Amino acid sequence: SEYQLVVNAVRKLQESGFYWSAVTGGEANLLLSAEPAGTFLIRDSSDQRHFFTLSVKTQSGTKNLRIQCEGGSFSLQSDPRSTQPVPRFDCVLKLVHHYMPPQAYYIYKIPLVLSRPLSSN
């Protein structure tokens, strides 16, 4: 706890296969440019107060959603107009599952839908 929880969360995130080290926001755009909507990856944030950012190919182009790490649990940055509290997760696989609806939450009003992590090749 207090550091072990954080480092264990980071570790497991790094290990997940969703995570792309040494990829910028611009490079995420390139990687996701030719991919179908709902293709996503997690990468390092270039922001001072964030470790990680989720990049997702949406119906309306590539969007970026900062990941919050409070208490060593993960959540996606939430609009204060949310009527529900922010769901939070002790692992990234659960986070990702939560935002995989079948054909649901939205971004400012376009659906946020993850479907498949970006693969190498």
Partner: peptide, 11 residues
């Protein structure tokens, strides 16, 4: 590439 940020509406 323009890098656009968003937040999620949880409702």
């Amino acid at each position: 590439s323009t890098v656009e940020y968003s937040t999620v509406v949880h409702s």
